[PDB]
């Protein structure tokens, strides 16, 4: 029957009680040793859908808020997919009314000294690294703004990273190393292109830099194409094969190269080359702004440890409580009828034929 397979709760009123759904092998036990008897009920499942199980879940319900605890990985998360697709198909309305949710176990556990922290996302993990890095940090330049910190610094750091992200998003089209150097090199103007002497010396300065900085076995060269409008060209020999990259009139006109220049404009305006960075007790002179940011991060991480979770079973029942099922701590996520739809589709996709 039902008793022996389900671990019910004291609460008798639906909409005041929540039913957890886990994979026996992953959290079946830990969930039970860490739940709260008052309002948390636990139904372990095993499956790829057991029919007896499917009659147990039906005979179960009662409970208004039903949580699905399952690993994020493709292999383990299947049990979640089978549920969503079974819901959408057999029970459409239950998903629509917002009764079904999806537990969101932390992806990280950061701890500095006595303090520990549970971070949900890789986006939140990024927000946390920036936060630490910046806290207590101030950048002393010789420019109009002797000290750059607080909200102002965050603006800079954000722009700098935004550019490096875009760089990596356009990496296949142009060498990552080159775009990084356009940031430091003076901007090339639509008007500048019309002149050849300025254009040639420019692309010469660029290439001349890349070569001196290159640690890997690569060879940079420059060439200027004459267009009846002068257009620079950067040829790179790597590894044994040389490819050439044209700086089209479009490129110099493109918003992508503008965001690179604007960044360089701010950086060059802040006299970054010569500066001091403190965070926050100590400081060290930096030759570049990125060298200052690398240093910030080296400080922020000095005494902390970071643990990544790959599965629920990695943590004790107590830990599982503090992270996933403690009302105050937990970070749940409700599923939409559009999400159950996608879970039905995925199940069918895996089922090439049936």
């Amino acid at each position: 029957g039902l008793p022996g397979k389900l671990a019910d709760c004291q609460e008798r009123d639906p909409a005041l009680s929540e039913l957890y759904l886990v994979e026996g092998d992953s959290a079946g036990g830990s969930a039970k040793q860490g739940r709260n008897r008052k309002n948390q009920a636990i139904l372990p499942l095993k499956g790829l859908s057991s029919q007896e199980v499917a009659t147990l879940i039906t005979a179960l319900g009662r409970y208004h808020s039903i949580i699905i605890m399952t690993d994020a990985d493709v292999d383990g998360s299947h049990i979640r997919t089978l549920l969503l697709t079974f819901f959408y198909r057999q029970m459409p309305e239950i998903v629509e009314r917002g009764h079904v949710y999806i537990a969101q176990p932390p992806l990280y556990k950061v701890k500095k000294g006595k303090q520990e922290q549970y971070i949900k996302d890789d986006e939140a993990m990024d927000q946390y690294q920036i936060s630490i890095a910046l806290d207590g940090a101030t950048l002393h330049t010789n420019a109009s703004a002797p000290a750059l910190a607080g909200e102002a610094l965050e603006k800079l750091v954000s722009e700098y990273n935004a550019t490096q992200k875009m760089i990596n998003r356009m990496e296949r089209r142009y060498p990552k190393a080159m775009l990084k150097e356009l940031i430091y090199q003076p901007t090339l103007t639509e008007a500048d292109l019309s002149d050849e002497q300025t254009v040639t010396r420019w692309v010469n300065a660029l290439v001349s830099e890349l070569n001196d900085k290159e640690q890997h076995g690569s060879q940079w060269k420059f060439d200027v194409h004459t267009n009846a409008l002068f257009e620079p060209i950067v040829r790179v020999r790597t590894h044994g094969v040389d490819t050439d990259y044209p700086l089209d009139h479009e490129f110099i006109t493109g918003g992508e190269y503008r965001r690179i220049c604007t960044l360089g404009e701010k950086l060059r305006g802040l006299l970054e080359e010569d500066a001091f960075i403190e965070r926050g007790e100590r400081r060290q002179p930096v030759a570049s702004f990125e060298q200052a940011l690398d240093w910030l991060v080296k400080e922020s991480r000095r005494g902390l440890s970071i643990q990544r979770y790959k599965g629920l079973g990695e943590m004790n029942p107590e830990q599982l409580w503090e992270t996933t099922m403690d009302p105050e701590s937990r970070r749940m996520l409700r599923v939409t009828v559009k999400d159950a739809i996608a879970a039905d589709q995925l199940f069918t996709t895996l089922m090439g034929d049936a």
Binding site: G1, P3, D8, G28, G29, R37, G313, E314
Partner: protein, 485 residues
């Protein structure tokens, strides 16, 4: 003998534990693998898969899911009264819920396990070959804990219940003062079994009978209380080796067939605060009449057929309580002795090496010249060998028994290479004085070790000191209750 007597002698070799450390080949391999790995209690946690592989690879290559289960059971609080494995993650429940994948769960040796394998490096136990013959495994663990009594065993035959460490350490100390003490003199410290899952033992005759003849049948009962607010039965603890979930199914089935009566609501409210089984008595029915009717038809009451069988000398024996205690104390004597002898030998060999190093410094310059002279190390070595070279410090004990009488101060071929091996950092005038300390401190040690080997009552005092250290560090309160009525 006949091929049948051998085949029976090997099947019994896997099934029975060793009275000395209560471990079967599987457990002893798994634990030794953890120790070699450096998977200590004070080091970071390691994934179960890491250990399971090491075991499968070197000591017990017979299924990954088998080796893991072994580690699992040694981690669970409900199956072992004193866990030998420290585990973080989902390790299964009393309900029978499985443990998480071996790649997710994390484990390291418990503080108590380091005592089980205390003095394992010092040649205190015999070593056997592994399946392929490339590795060596301990024939037994040099244990400071009487595990066979403490944690017990099961035969797929023998059935030994766990016991409180504090009680047992006492009983052991009692056997140490008087070798002739009776089973009733022991039962003054060891009243009975002490299961991890605390419960109530009703009969005291069964345990007295089992400590005396090695065999007996004892009663175990669930700790249930009746509660008002209609009427409800609440179980705080259940009998050892009892699956709580299947227990629940049973009661539900009984009420279905109506073999038991007076139950309206049966729910399992077990949570992070502890175990809690709820049975709401129906109106027109008594709670304790329903309870006793349950005891009579339910796994709530279980008789534990004690059958203490364990391999003493590689041979199966049915032993009473005293026989198990004595065996642990003979094992301690042997480990303690063998330990000393090894410690003494090592001390000798180290003091012998030191003497050469010390003499080298005083005569260092002439040596340095020689080293510069001969192109080949063996040629400079032979030179050091040809001519012999802190007098109060030097004043024969330090010299190993194997060392010849011949070896100014005489040098060994090995010592010549030791002077050649010494690095340039040791040359400093601060290392000389430091080495002088180690040397002198080792003399005081060898002298102490000799005092131990000579005095037979001294050895029995060090053993008693070790047992006490175990009772304090790892001793804890009783959990099951014995109520003879």
């Amino acid at each position: 003998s006949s091929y049948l007597d051998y085949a029976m002698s090997v099947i019994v070799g896997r099934a029975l534990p060793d009275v000395r450390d209560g471990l079967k080949p599987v457990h002893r391999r798994v634990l030794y693998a953890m120790n070699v790995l450096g998977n200590d209690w004070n080091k970071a946690y390691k994934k179960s898969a890491r250990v399971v592989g090491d075991v499968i690879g070197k000591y017990h290559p017979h299924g990954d899911s088998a080796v893991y289960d072994t580690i699992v059971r040694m981690a669970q609080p409900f199956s072992l009264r004193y866990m030998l494995v420290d585990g973080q993650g989902n390790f299964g429940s009393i309900d029978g819920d499985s443990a998480a994948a071996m790649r997710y769960t994390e484990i390291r040796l418990a503080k108590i396990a380091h005592e089980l394998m205390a003095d394992l490096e010092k040649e205190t136990v015999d070593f056997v070959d592994n399946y392929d013959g490339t590795e060596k495994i301990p024939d037994v663990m040099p244990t400071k804990i009487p595990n066979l009594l403490v944690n017990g065993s099961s035969g797929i035959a023998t059935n030994i219940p766990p016991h409180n460490l504090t009680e047992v350490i006492n009983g052991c100390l009692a056997y140490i003062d008087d070798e002739d003490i009776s089973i009733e003199g022991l039962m003054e410290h060891i009243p009975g079994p002490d299961f991890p899952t605390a419960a109530i033992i009703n009969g005291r005759r069964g345990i007295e009978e089992a400590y005396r003849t090695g065999r007996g049948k004892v009663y175990i009962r669930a700790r249930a209380e009746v509660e008002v607010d209609r009427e409800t039965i609440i179980v705080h603890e259940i009998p050892y080796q009892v699956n709580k979930a299947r227990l629940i199914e049973k009661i539900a089935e009984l009420v279905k067939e109506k073999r038991v009566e007076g139950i309206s609501a049966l729910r399992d409210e077990s949570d992070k605060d502890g175990m809690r089984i709820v049975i709401e008595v129906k109106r027109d029915a008594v709670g304790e009449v329903v309870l006793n009717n349950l005891y009579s038809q339910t796994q709530l009451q279980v008789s534990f057929g004690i059958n203490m069988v364990a391999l003493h000398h590689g041979q199966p024996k049915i032993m009473n309580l005293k026989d198990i205690i004595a065996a642990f104390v003979r094992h301690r004597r042997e480990v303690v002795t063998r330990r000393t002898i090894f410690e003494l030998r090592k001390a000798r060999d180290r003091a012998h090496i030191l003497e050469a190093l010390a003499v080298a410094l005083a005569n260092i310059d002439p040596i340095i010249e020689l080293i510069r002279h001969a192109p080949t190390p063996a040629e400079a070595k032979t030179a050091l060998v040809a001519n012999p070279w802190v007098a109060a410090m030097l004043e024969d004990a330090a010299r190993p028994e194997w060392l010849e009488p011949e070896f100014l101060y005489y040098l060994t071929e090995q010592q010549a290479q030791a002077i050649l091996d010494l690095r340039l950092q040791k040359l400093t005038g601060l290392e000389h004085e430091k080495l002088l300390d180690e040397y002198k401190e080792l003399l005081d040690q060898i002298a102490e070790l000799l005092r131990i080997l000579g005095s037979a009552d001294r050895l029995m005092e060090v053993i008693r000191e070790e047992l006490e250290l175990v009772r304090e560090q790892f001793g804890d309160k009783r959990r099951t209750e014995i109520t003879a009525n």
